[PDB]
């Protein structure tokens with residue numbers, strides 16, 4: 001994945017401030033609240049009936065941490081997203097049966113959460129760099145589907 | 147663009163039977179009828195007031211011919227679609243201002259036209275091969291946008 | 293959305309389909325599974341092999357529901373009520389996939405109806421399948437705007453207040469940088485940061501949303517002139533409204549730390565989707 005020197009710098013600088021635990025639970029929780037059909041993959045997580053229930057669900061918080069942790073390691077390998085995520089791509093297709101459109105929804109929510117958390121520091125050019133990155137990761141995760 | 151030996155052959159075999167002028171005029175006219183907002187580029191083409199007027203417009207027909215002729219030559223370079231269409235990509239962005247979503251809509255309408263034209267010979271596997279190709283062409287034409 | 297001439301065209305085409313509905317339905321599914329493999333993720337419990345009894349049976353259910361829809365074209369939301377519920381509450385299929393099946397159903401009809409599949413009928417059939425898809429996904433997020441959604445939107449927009457214009461221009465700037473293809477609609481603009489053209493346009497967009505909030509229960513009339521303008525003069529591809537909507541959401545998030553809760557986020561997203569739906573309602 002090709003980013004300009006300015007884009008890569010903006011991405012890495014912001015991420016150094018991200019607490020992956022906190023942001024990861026927030027991003028997955030909002031996904032389940034804003035786009036409730038995504039709850040179809042998480043029937044064993046318990047109570048997802050209301051926003052307050054989703055956002056305080058410890059299984060949601062845990063999974064969020066796992067998901068953004070893996071996203072985090074991808075940011076260290078921006079020039080080969082496909083190779084970095086190949087195993088997880090196969091896992092999501094063959095074992096979990098996750099429609100890759102969900103990866104794009106999560107990207108949208110993640111950008112909203114970064115904007116919410118960082119306010120004015122999340123400038124239009126920083127967002128633009130993050131949009132390239134979330135699209136690259138979604139494409140990488142979808143690549144081994146068949 | 148990566149297709150299997152069987153897919154490239156299925157694509158090329160059918161295309162050998164196509165009258166490019168006829169199918170070009172048919173595909174561009176149906177584009178303008180089915181998704182009329184795409185008419186925004188062609189106000190200098192005269193009367194587009196009804197479906198019959200569109201389909202029988204000589205300026206529409208000639209454009210359809212120009213466009214599918216370029217498409218046709220692209221089929222000779224399926225392993226280098228990006229390189230083949232690079233200059234046209236820049237032209238469509240910097241000078242023509244064509245939203246690349248238009249290319250995808252044209253791909254959809256072209257597949258329909260091939261199905262109408264060839265009937266049962268346009269089998270599900272041949273369709274699948276053509277879907278990859280029209281997506282590859284759309285992506286190549288959008289590649290130099292900025 | 294469906295003119296009476298559209299409805300006549302659909303009745304004629306589907307009547308031609310006749311007793312082959314079931315077979316055509318199964319063909320459309322096979323074409324989708326092959327051309328759009330990600331859709332197979334909704335059917336891991338099926339034998340998806342060619343000619344499988346499961347696929348043929350499902351194809352026949354799909355066609356009968358379309359038959360039912362054709363028979364009740366002027367009361368489709370009521371006719372497909374149980375099916376809307378089922379996809380929203382149980383199957384939970386991402387809405388993007390309805391477009392993929394619709395395309396494969398159109399390809400199937402084209403391949404079997406040479407005489408019937410004229411440009412006008414193609415157009416009517418495409419509009420018809422888009423309407424069906426719209427109805428099948430109409431209950432995915434609680435349906436239209438609930439009073440709790442309306443409350444949430446009014447509270448957040450009231451906080452926006454006089455900054456509505458300013459936030460309109462930021463949203464545009466974010467869209468132009470993040471989604472460079474949208475710039476193709478503004479070749480007459482200076483798009484540089486701080487441009488007065490972009491600020492003036494952002495204020496117009498913001499003012500229109502202000503009007504929409506104030507008429508949240510009467511949005512089509514409030515926005516009728518704008519629906520006209522986008523559909524018949526500007527002719528903006530409908531995909532682009534989702535992109536501005538996202539950038540408006542990001543803008544609100546960056547300026548509303550306390551207000552932008554998950555619930556308010558969900559309500560705002562639903563509201564901008566409704567606005568987007570109104571603005572593209574007269575395109576075809």
Ligand code: HEM
Pocket residue numbers: 038041042066067068070071088092096098102103106137141
């Ligand atoms: C940024 C995109 C994503 C990344 C990097 C990612 C990564 C991961 C990782 C690392 C695992 C753990 C596998 C294991 O420990 O066996 C996992 C599992 C899972 N993910 Fe993904 N994920 C992403 C997106 C999604 C989305 C959006 C959905 C669905 C809405 C999803 C649904 C699941 C499910 C259902 C599991 C298994 C949970 C369980 O074991 O009970 N993932 N993901």
Ligand code: HEM
Pocket residue numbers: 184187212213214216217234237238242244248249252283287
């Ligand atoms: C497969 C997709 C397409 C291909 C291969 C293609 C190719 C071409 C070619 C070969 C030219 C001529 C450039 C020149 O004169 O140097 C052209 C021009 C043009 N195309 Fe595209 N095109 C495609 C799709 C579209 C679509 C979907 C639209 C708009 C809805 C569009 C709008 C135009 C316009 C407005 C012109 C200029 C016509 C003129 O000045 O007479 N193109 N295209």
Ligand code: HEM
Pocket residue numbers: 331334335350353354357358375379383385389390391393394424425428
């Ligand atoms: C024109 C659009 C569609 C129509 C009219 C439609 C209608 C139906 C009908 C009639 C049923 C069976 C209900 C019953 O008898 O209990 C069904 C089930 C189902 N649909 Fe939809 N459908 C559409 C699109 C889709 C799409 C796009 C997908 C996924 C790619 C999908 C996935 C499913 C699944 C997974 C089932 C359950 C099958 C089973 O397990 O028996 N549907 N659909």
Ligand code: HEM
Pocket residue numbers: 474477478493496497500501518521522526528532533534536567568571
């Ligand atoms: C929530 C969505 C939107 C709203 C509320 C909205 C509203 C408006 C308004 C109020 C105007 C000015 C009308 C007048 O001059 O009286 C306008 C113009 C315009 N809109 Fe939209 N718009 C939306 C989305 C979009 C999108 C997504 C695009 C394209 C990416 C777009 C492209 C344009 C263009 C090109 C103009 C004309 C600007 C000029 O030349 O002065 N709009 N819009």
